[PDB]
């Protein structure tokens, strides 16, 4: 152990993530290790490990040098299996090993995501401070311009820092939304208290519900404030039966993936194949809005669970998010 | 569509009809028998918001024509001897909200042997403060020449704060003054008051006041020759309202050649057949496309200096 060790290892793992590791130790590990030959390092007698492997083997896991969204029900599951290994390691010998072994044949997004969540929640990651996403995978936090300016630097082997950019809109209250600090927090908040947490993982995040209610209420408040300061008017509430008034162009790019799709202004909400129907929301919204109005949330049995009490708002945040 | 119309049977009457057209929008088939509307009357149209919506439209109908002309050359704008040296305001330029009182008597019916009660209405109108012009400029000609002092007040930034271009802003400029003065042969500083402006008219005498006066003259022996035509806008309206913080407008002083202007002849309120005295078209010389500012900028007799207006709360 140590930390200036654990730490070191981490830094190495997340170094030039888009390419096979250059740190020799990480690679003989990456090669010689077998997550299945001492089912003892694992507190599960390695059921986790044996499940990743099985996938890695039938090679039914997402490819490397490809994008990844945490909203993709499969990409998530895969990402989250790495979490589950890293998670039941008794000591560092087992983490390093895996987050090396996998690091090299699992996709980067799943991987970056997996490592962070794992470091954050696993028993074994106390000493560590995680590098800032913004510098680990800069395509998600940097402009598309600066990105290309950086690819040029590199082509020519000439160094230096480029100035990023952001009178026509409400990309006047932009400084708020595009800040690398908020973006960090926004992701961290949901890494700290993930929507996918099962108390099987080890403990129980306390009031994730009210936490959820509140955190957004404040982005939402903080946001409303800035627009105040900009002669702008408080934000419109979004409806599924209306047009999406204010659309934008992000001018942002994926590393592997392409450029973030843009949305024109005054658009009509389309039924999106694979996710869900527009109407599917409308009804959800109704079911929600009826719990609130009745006084109770009704479970699967037709058991009405009361929410006209203090535990109220979290039970509500459990069903809303 | 006045009667000067060449083919009124074909081009009809856009502007007028547009008035009546916008007015019954409250009752087109007239099922309600509502009276005419705010827009179907001159002393009340400026009231309704579409008023300005309707004239922006008319405005760019004209602009389409106004803009078809080739920009102006150099040889075009220049007044050969005469060059303005400086433009300064021995002022402030500060606007606030005064208070006015007109009388509500003709409004209430008073029959007979029931006597008059003096009722009044008090309104809140805008106002500014006197400030004079100080135009400094030489006659590098051999004698004396007549000159037209043309002064526009254009905007500078966008309200996005983009700062438009005397193309983007040339059309946006409001006329502040226009006067003909004789220039002497060399260094001279001409001055001009808020109060001498040609596009302005003072508030008018009260009715009673005009009564007292019509009367006071008939009981023992009347000169309001000041107010027999009056085409202009309220002096109080001279300058725009602004921000309390203040803003910078762009002041345009363009001095054209009086002898070719008035190359032929009140004459401000030509109410009786009186030939408009200036010959330049209207809005000269900002009425034409100004593609490269590069030009306005190199005629001696045109000069622009930024002013600043503040609003006292
Ligand atoms: Cu969130
Ligand atoms: Cu009109």
UniProtKB/Swiss-Prot annotation, chain A:
Glycosylated residues, chain numbering: 163
Cell compartment(s), UniProt: Secreted, Extracellular space
Tissue specificity field: Hemolymph.
S-S bridge residues: 89-94
Any further remark recorded for this protein: The A chain contains two copper-binding sites. Three histidine residues are ligands to each copper ion.
Subunit structure: Hexamer of a number of different chains, of which A, B, and C have been identified.
Role played: Hemocyanins are copper-containing oxygen carriers occurring freely dissolved in the hemolymph of many mollusks and arthropods.
Protein name (Swiss-Prot/TrEMBL): Hemocyanin A chain
The organism of origin for this protein: Panulirus interruptus
Part of the whole protein covered: 5 to 329 of 657
